[PDB]
Design a protein around this ligand. Sequence first.
Ligand SMILES: CCCCCCCC(=O)O
Ligand SMILES: CCCCCCCC(=O)O
Lengths: 365, 367
Amino acid sequence: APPTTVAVIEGMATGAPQRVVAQADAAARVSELFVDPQQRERISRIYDKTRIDTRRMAVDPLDDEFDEFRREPATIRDRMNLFYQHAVPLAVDVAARALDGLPAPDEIGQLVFVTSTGFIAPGVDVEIVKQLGLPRSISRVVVNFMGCAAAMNAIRTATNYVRAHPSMKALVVCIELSSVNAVFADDINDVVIHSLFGDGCGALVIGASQVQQPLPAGNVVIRSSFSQLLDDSEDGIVLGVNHDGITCELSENLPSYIYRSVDPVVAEMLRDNGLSKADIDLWAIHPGGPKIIEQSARSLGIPVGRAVQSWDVLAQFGNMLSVSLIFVLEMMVAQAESDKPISTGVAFAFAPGVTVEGMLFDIIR
Amino acid sequence: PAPPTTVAVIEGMATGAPQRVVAQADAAARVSELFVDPQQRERISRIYDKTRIDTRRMAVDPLDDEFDEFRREPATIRDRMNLFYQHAVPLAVDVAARALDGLPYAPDEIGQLVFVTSTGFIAPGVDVEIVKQLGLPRSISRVVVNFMGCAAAMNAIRTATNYVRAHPSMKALVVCIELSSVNAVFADDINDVVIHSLFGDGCGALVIGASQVQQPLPAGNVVIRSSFSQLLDDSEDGIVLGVNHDGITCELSENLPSYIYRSVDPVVAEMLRDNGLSKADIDLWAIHPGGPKIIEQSARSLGIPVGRAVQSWDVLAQFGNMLSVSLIFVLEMMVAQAESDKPISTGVAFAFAPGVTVEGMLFDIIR
Ligand SMILES: CCCCCCCC(=O)O
Ligand SMILES: CCCCCCCC(=O)O
């Protein structure tokens, strides 16, 4: 007999590096390194097509001082040291603020640490424990290279924890510093990647509640969680470690995989929870790029602009991989879409596989 | 709400490793050749002898000159990760298939896959090929636990136990694979040679389900009673993992044995007390076979004779240090050869991760 308890987000917080990089300025830095004017207009037409206004970088890519370093080979170890150095102070602040809204450090039983842009042990999860004075006996899980949908896998892990240990809470911390892996382009993909990815941190505090028990406004109930590895999509999203930093490779066919897959997956899931698409008030589509939001919406047969919080996060921060969906959730909690006392929502994102990960959730108003 | 009164059971287990055996004597010969001073070659042979390792398994033949060009060449990390994938998949899939072959054929009951490695980094990775080639459900929950060192199987089991305790109808599959051989480079200092003397290759897989407590279980099942974890202080240097241009690396402090001596007893003592036991109630000590000093200092801390941990010594001797995998090997041995007449054997497993952290389980083997 499964426990009849449910997982609740009781606490959230976001953060990002102080350094803003205007998309206009980034396109200038790149266009300078082209001669043929037919090629310079293609660069500017790429950066304009991103529908990104700003990003936050831990390391300024529009800074000449480290152009020597970013061209130099065999720097991966230095970049991982660089990741640790920025990640700790950012991670610890965001986590501290996710907890600051709430009553007892000895009740936090699990820390789930998510990144696909950092690889170093002992890592940030340890400094989080020490600097926040969490229990030395806390369960730690490090989820790596699960891409942009990694927060969904982390939440599912946290949900399993608190449902097996209802007295206890789980702390989920995601941090992505794409900027630490920035290099001078060889291929088209490289320039496209460098045009989209930014930096951010998000943190969640998850606890268990008895079903039907009353909950304060702003709590998010995780009702249901779904995964789907698709066929003939291995090329879709590819992550690798190079001598000069971690890399991401996105197939030209990725938008086609997204169009094909989203509706059947989301349709089956909703049917399984006795819902139709007309019962969803909130669509938290992963803001990975314009193409990902566009093709996700077209698959679902909803107007592209319906996912306004996704568009807003892309515009202000770009693609922050795992973190992006914590930002979308914070916005949805912060600005209610209607008068309803509960808002029902679907979140999903794409990981290597290709895999579709998502949640059905309720925000209490 | 009240916590579920269910317990996690290992219902399935299997090990594997590369076909290729490499005698410790032969490995020491190749390494001594690449050195000049006869006083230096004495130290190398006395290092390899001191490991108390007889054989290891390599996916990649390290005493093979075609590979020596490559392992001197810089900026090869991507190629080595491609090399990891290429060997890992066939090995991973076989070991997982054999962990499941022990049970009624129902792939649709596997709800979680936890994939553990600190020697490989590539997406989409082995976890995906495992799902496809075994025809596990496309809807299966996947978690990739990376760079949690040699105690990573303990973190994985804890994760799997939380899953099946929240989803009692469902089972979780834990797969650990380490190929140290794909990160082999020519030594610089001392740590380099010591690391290259200890680490080997292996794969282990576990199938975990939930039982109602006191409900009867077949012989060979392992009951996970408790999991425990302890981050220690002034021990950051103890165990360090990093990614280099020419492969993943490991750095072990000269003070690591001191951290192990000081940590193990208090941690294990408190844990046992909390489950209503003393050290005199333990029948099985599954100390992580990381090296002689780790087994020795663990035993000295606990105040048990060093040779008491027989299966740890045997796994080191035959396979060396396989990080996360090593303790699945120790568990298989303990299941395979009963230590006494008792119908249940109670045991403690623990290992060391970056932090430094002590991770472990209290467990019962059904006889
Ligand atoms: C997932 C790691 C890839 C990051 C590449 C650098 C992109 C940028 O920040 O411009
Ligand atoms: C954690 C990775 C360690 C790589 C060292 C290689 C040891 C060997 O295979 O001889």
